[PDB]
Amino acid sequence: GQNPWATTTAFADFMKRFNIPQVHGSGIFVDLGRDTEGYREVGGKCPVFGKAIQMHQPAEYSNNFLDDAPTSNDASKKPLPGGFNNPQVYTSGQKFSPIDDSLLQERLGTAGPKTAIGRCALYAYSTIAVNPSTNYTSTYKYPFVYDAVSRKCYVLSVSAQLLKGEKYCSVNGTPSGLTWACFEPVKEKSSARALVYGSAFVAEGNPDAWQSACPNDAVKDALFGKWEDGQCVPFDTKTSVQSDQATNKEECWKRVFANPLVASDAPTTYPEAAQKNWNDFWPVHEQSSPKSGGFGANWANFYLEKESGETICAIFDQVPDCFAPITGAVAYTALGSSTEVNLPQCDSASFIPIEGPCNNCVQVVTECVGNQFDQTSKACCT
Numbered sequence: 001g002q003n004p005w006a007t008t009t010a011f012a013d014f015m016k017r018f019n020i021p022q023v024h025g026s027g028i029f030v031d032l033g034r035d036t037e038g039y040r041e042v043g044g045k046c047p048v049f050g051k052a053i054q055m056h057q058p059a060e061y062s063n064n065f066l067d068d069a070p071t072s073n074d075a076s077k078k079p080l081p082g083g084f085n086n087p088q089v090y091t092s093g094q095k096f097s098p099i100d101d102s103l104l105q106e107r108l109g110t111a112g113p114k115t116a117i118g119r120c121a122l123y124a125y126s127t128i129a130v131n132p133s134t135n136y137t138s139t140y141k142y143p144f145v146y147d148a149v150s151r152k153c154y155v156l157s158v159s160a161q162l163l164k165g166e167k168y169c170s171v172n173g174t175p176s177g178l179t180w181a182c183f184e185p186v187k188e189k190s191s192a193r194a195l196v197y198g199s200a201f202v203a204e205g206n207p208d209a210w211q212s213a214c215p216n217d218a219v220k221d222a223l224f225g226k227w228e229d230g231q232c233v234p235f236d237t238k239t240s241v242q243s244d245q246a247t248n249k250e251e252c253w254k255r256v257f258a259n260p261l262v263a264s265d266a267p268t269t270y271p272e273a274a275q276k277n278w279n280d281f282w283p284v285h286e287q288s289s290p291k292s293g294g295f296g297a298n299w300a301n302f303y304l305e306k307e308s309g310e311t312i313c314a315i316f317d318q319v320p321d322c323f324a325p326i327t328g329a330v331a332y333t334a335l336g337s338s339t340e341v342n343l344p345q346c347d348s349a350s351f352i353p354i355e356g357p358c359n360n361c362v363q364v365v366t367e368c369v370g371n372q373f374d375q376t377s378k379a380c381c382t
């Protein structure tokens with residue numbers, strides 16, 4: 001009884017998507033998987049759906065990270081107003097960023113990318129960066145944020161994703177006098193905007209590949225598992241890094257992204273250091289800069305524990321290689337959206353059913369019923 005998820009091009013293409021260290025290959029919470037010219041550079045190959053940078057400027061401020069980043073200091077404003085958005089104008093006087101997707105389609109041409117995410121990544125990948133200190137052109141690549149509501153593409157000249165600690169930044173104006181307010185990445189689900197954060201390297205090769213290669217969506221009525229003993233066995237309390245209750249599935253979706261063990265390239269140590277300058281837009285690359293490579297607790301199973309009446313978010317850190325179809329369960333990642341897709345259909349006419357071994361008169365049977373994957377227990381003592 002072989003893993004049917006390797007048994008078919010369509011099943012194998014679907015499972016491959018969830019091999020995150022392979023297909024993404026960089027941090028997810030904070031992505032700093034590359035370095036160039038001495039700076040940490042955003043590097044993952046997969047778009048990160050719903051990723052926003054939460055800021056903490058005092059109440060009167062805009063506190064919107066898609067705001068123009070500052071072009072000059074004002075020593076008299078602490079913290080300095082601004083977001084992460086690249087604020088350069090073209091010599092025509094048109095802004096670099098944000099740009100309407102409409103226009104990008106025009107500017108990329110007849111053979112440009114067929115997805116808004118591919119366009120926005122390519123647009124970033126093509127943008128000639130400029131050192132925010134020396135003021136000289138650089139080979140550094142900016143990350144991007146596509147907003148699927150405004151249909152606008154943003155290129156961020158600020159590539160920093162996580163700034164923390166009262167030595168280095170203010171929360172809501174405390175301590176006072178700090179140049180930078182604090183900030184950290186968060187999954188958001190808002191009706192007003194629908195964000196996708198990515199490195200420019202989404203564009204590299206085929207900018208549209210993410211659609212097919214990456215774990216863009218939650219999987220409905222299925223759990224991530226591991227094939228063993230002729231059966232998909234889902235990850236649960238036994239085999240997870242945490243498995244606390246969640247009030248609802250969206251909370252689980254947010255949790256996996258924010259969880260302390262998610263693949264992340266943030267420095268785990270705190271070098272006694274002076275305050276960042278107003279224009280330290282890019283993290284400096286140090287010999288000890290961590291690279292998760294996208295290994296970590298990046299997957300979450302959301303299910304109703306039959307035993308206890310509670311919904312569980314079971315976050316785990318193994319690459320899964322099958323799905324257990326279970327009605328009402330959801331499989332999430334730190335990369336994907338909370339929007340839900342089905343398991344690939346299944347061909348009932350040819351699909352060969354696979355039987356687990358009999359243990360205590362119950363075996364697990366995987367079949368195709370009405371063209372859908374089915375996993376059930378079956379009595380096997382007469």
Ligand SMILES: *[C@@H]1O[C@H](CO)[C@@H](O)[C@H](O)[C@H]1NC(C)=O
Nearest residue numbers: 071072131132133134135136
């Ligand atoms: C960078 O160029 C700007 C002009 O846009 C200038 O105001 C600033 O002093 C320069 N920064 C340097 C070279 O320190």
